[PDB]
């Protein structure tokens, strides 16, 4: 059926340029207007640009006028966004979107591609234990501090997926160094530390980093 696939996202130093692409199948791409929309991390949707089927017009959000260029190749069934003079505030997930009518319909949205604009450089995370401490009963919290990575995202699982109940993985914060840090925690019965193994699984695809860190109480 109807699908839209963005590619070309990654990281960019400020003032530089990046080109996105979106490929379409399952609908008559050569007769549809096509839009870009972006969404910065946990912020709102922002409309970026639109181009009709024949390219006869190109419209742009005020914040990207003069720096961004939308174009299309109906032959290949693909849409492009050329971004120049990129700024920190252009960091966002970029989506292609269309419609069988005029307005956006959920069927016609892409999966998104992340773009991060920053003077920081790609970096894999350091993974540190958040060690638990009465151990005969009660509740223990433990976790992993996933620190100083770039760009987003990391994924965190626990015991390779077999531990999901009580897991909270927090949204990253941006440190003043330009690097991200987050935490992942789980509450377990404190008596389980004597019988059970707890390992957090961290993945940072942008740096090909894969860490498994066992989290144990520290030796008194």
């Amino acid at each position: 059926q109807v699908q839209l696939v963005e590619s070309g996202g990654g990281v960019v130093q400020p003032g530089r340029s990046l080109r996105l692409s979106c490929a379409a199948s399952g609908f008559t791409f050569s007769s549809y207007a096509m839009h870009w929309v972006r969404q910065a991390p946990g912020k709102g949707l922002e409309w970026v640009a639109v181009i009709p089927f024949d390219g006869r017009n190109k419209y742009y959000a005020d914040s990207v006028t003069g720096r961004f260029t939308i174009s299309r190749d109906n032959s290949k069934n693909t849409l492009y966004l050329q971004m120049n003079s990129l700024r920190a505030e252009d960091t966002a997930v970029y989506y292609c979107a269309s419609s069988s009518g005029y307005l956006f319909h959920s069927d016609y949205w892409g999966q998104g591609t992340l773009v991060t604009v920053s003077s920081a450089s790609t970096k894999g995370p350091s993974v540190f234990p958040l060690a638990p401490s009465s151990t005969s009963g009660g509740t223990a919290a433990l976790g992993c501090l996933v620190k100083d990575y770039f760009p987003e995202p990391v994924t965190v699982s626990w015991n390779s997926g077999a531990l999901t109940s009580g897991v909270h993985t927090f949204p990253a914060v941006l440190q003043s160094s330009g690097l991200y840090s987050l935490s992942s925690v789980v509450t377990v019965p404190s008596s389980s530390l004597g019988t059970q193994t707890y390992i957090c699984n961290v993945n940072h695809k942008p740096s090909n980093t894969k860490v498994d860190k066992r989290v144990e109480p520290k030796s008194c």
């Binding site: 949707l45 959000a61 958040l130 509740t139 919290a141 501090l145 909270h168 927090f170 520290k218």
Partner: protein, 214 residues
């Protein structure tokens, strides 16, 4: 462009409540106003077009009204799968512009946090930094205050906080706070504590440790 201002930015309601969201345009948009629903990791869904027409297959408990510069989305009886973020969007003019969004969260009873404190690992101390972590687990409402104290001295500017979305099972939040110090500043002090203030706590809860398992 035409600037769209939604209010409120956040809202807590219970199942069965009547919910009303307002959107104001900076100039007239006639009736070319749309409302969308977005759940996280989901594509936006069109609810209302041209200000008051219901999209095909959208519960009749959703309605919209208005013209000109002031517009309203209303949910007559709030249902469980309607807790989401709601955007208005004008299409009178290019550039198309979205409002900033309205998050509709679930109301529930007060629930005080379970508090936990984590010292920095030896591994991170070898690297020259110390992160101290304070966890506030499963609390409601979202408002909480975390104060770091080092040998009883309030700290400021050296911590960052993050909060989860509402849990799917029990509608609470959790919050993580990290205090960051250089290894040098860390070893200059003994007592590390986070103090937590919250509605479900009759007085502030403190959790602490002494550097060097003391």
């Amino acid at each position: 462009d035409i600037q769209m201002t939604q209010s409120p930015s956040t809202l807590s309601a219970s199942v069965g409540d009547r919910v009303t969201i307002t959107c104001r345009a900076s100039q007239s948009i006639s009736n070319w106003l749309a409302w969308f629903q977005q759940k996280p990791g989901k594509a936006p869904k069109l609810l209302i077009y041209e200000a008051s027409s219901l999209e095909s297959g959208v519960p009749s408990r959703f309605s919209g009204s208005g013209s000109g510069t002031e517009f309203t989305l209303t949910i007559s009886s709030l249902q469980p799968d309607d807790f989401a973020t709601y955007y208005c969007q004008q299409y009178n003019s290019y550039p198309w512009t979205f409002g900033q969004g309205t998050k509709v969260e679930i109301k529930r009873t007060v629930a005080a946090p379970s508090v936990f404190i984590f010292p920095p690992s030896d591994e991170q101390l070898k690297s020259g930094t110390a992160s101290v972590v304070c966890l506030l687990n499963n609390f409601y409402p979202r408002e909480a205050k975390v104060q770091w104290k080092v040998d009883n001295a309030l700290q400021s500017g050296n911590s960052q906080e993050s909060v989860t979305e509402q849990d799917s099972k029990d509608s609470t939040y959790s919050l993580s706070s990290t205090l960051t110090l250089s290894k040098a500043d860390y070893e200059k002090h003994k007592v590390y504590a986070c103090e937590v203030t919250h509605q479900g706590l009759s007085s502030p809860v403190t959790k602490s440790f002494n550097r060097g398992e003391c």
